[PDB]
């Protein structure tokens, strides 16, 4: 599967061959609650933790399944 991981210059999509292929799309506050915007980090894990005590953390294990609300394949 592929993974829209926000890591390099643009959204860098990487295919995780091993067992860990889960695409997480977690979010918290990165100036939105402050001034700019919310936090968005997309990666490829094996066990996406459910950190919903304040940060919106989603878990999807499918090719390019971790796209964010602000920017996405338009």
């Amino acid at each position: 599967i592929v993974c829209h991981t926000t890591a390099t210059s643009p959204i860098s999509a990487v295919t995780c061959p091993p067992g860990e292929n889960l695409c997480y799309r977690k979010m918290w506050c990165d100036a939105f609650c402050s001034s700019r915007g919310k936090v968005v980090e997309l990666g490829c894990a094996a066990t996406c933790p459910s950190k919903k005590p304040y940060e919106e953390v989603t878990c999807c294990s499918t090719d390019k399944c971790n796209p964010h609300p602000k920017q996405r394949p338009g």
Binding site: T5, T8, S9, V39, V40, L42, H68, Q71
Partner: peptide, 25 residues
């Protein structure tokens, strides 16, 4: 010129105002 790593800072809010993280020099 960019023989380093990859880091990103995406904030939900502005489709045209993403903050990236890459080594300049």
């Amino acid at each position: 010129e960019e023989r380093g790593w990859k880091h990103w800072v995406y904030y939900t809010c502005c489709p045209d105002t993403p903050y990236l993280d890459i080594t300049e020099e």
